[PDB]
Amino acid sequence: RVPLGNANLIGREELQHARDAVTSAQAQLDVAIQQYNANQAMILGTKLE
């Protein structure tokens, strides 16, 4: 969507919303990463026995 915006051939609200969606997706990925890290802190030994 970005290049079309350089010219005035796409609504500015739509580009704003695309940017916001990117940011939200990044934040949710961070949430998932932190959950995985939280679980990993209990089994960091790397040996079952």
Partner: protein
């Protein structure tokens, strides 16, 4: 009869001028739409049928 004919011709000239202005505006609008459709296709958000229709 001559009176009415000349008056009618004059009004016709004026109507022609107005119609020409309208059609120029329509042409510009269509050109803008075609440019939008072509850019969308170049970036990959539209097919080629849209380009041909424009």
């Amino acid at each position: 009869s001559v009176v009415q004919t000349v008056r009618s011709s004059f009004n016709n000239i004026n109507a022609s001028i107005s119609s020409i202005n309208a059609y120029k505006q329509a042409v510009v609008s269509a050109q803008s739409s075609l440019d939008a459709m072509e850019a969308g296709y170049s970036v990959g958000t539209r097919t080629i049928v849209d380009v041909l229709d424009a």
